[PDB]
Amino acid sequence: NGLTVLPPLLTDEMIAQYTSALLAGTITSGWTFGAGAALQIPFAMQMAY
Amino acid sequence: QFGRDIADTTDAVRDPQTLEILDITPCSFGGVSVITPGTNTSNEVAVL
Ligand SMILES: *[C@@H]1O[C@H](CO)[C@@H](O)[C@H](O)[C@H]1NC(C)=O
Fold it and tell me: What happens after mutating residue 4 to N (chain A)?
């Protein structure tokens, strides 16, 4: 009827890959993966920071 | 004799001769989009 719906560029199964990467960074490496380097740190030491 | 969608678009009909029931779907239409590199790089294109 002239109306159309276009797909998003990032599919839902690919947004869920970014949210996984964001929290898998956050859980293993604190904030440092924002400042370039994903420096690992054990999680009870990240919570002390 | 005929049927409507949620938005009152007509989307089914009886054939009045054989009382079987037909769906109406719009004839397909959509934007022709030209994927191009910059003309500086090439004159080749792909069409979506
Ligand atoms: C692109 O086109 C312009 C205009 O002719 C020209 O100045 C420029 O050098 C070109 N660059 C390349 C990489 O083709």
Answer: In strain: Lambda/C.37
